[PDB]
Amino acid sequence: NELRCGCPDCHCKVDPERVFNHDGEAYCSQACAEQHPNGEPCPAPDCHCERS
């Protein structure tokens, strides 16, 4: 299915040894997993997930 981030428009590279599984889904960062609680987007400075 191609390892993809739970975010609707996010597809950053996810690493198994640090995979953030939240509610059974994988995310690229702890930010996407928690729907960006600290208001912090993901490490990708060009990504627009949750922004748009």
Ligand SMILES: [Cd+2]
């Ligand atoms: Cd993103």
Ligand SMILES: [Cd+2]
């Ligand atoms: Cd990302």
Ligand SMILES: [Cd+2]
């Ligand atoms: Cd993400």
Ligand SMILES: [Cd+2]
């Ligand atoms: Cd996100």
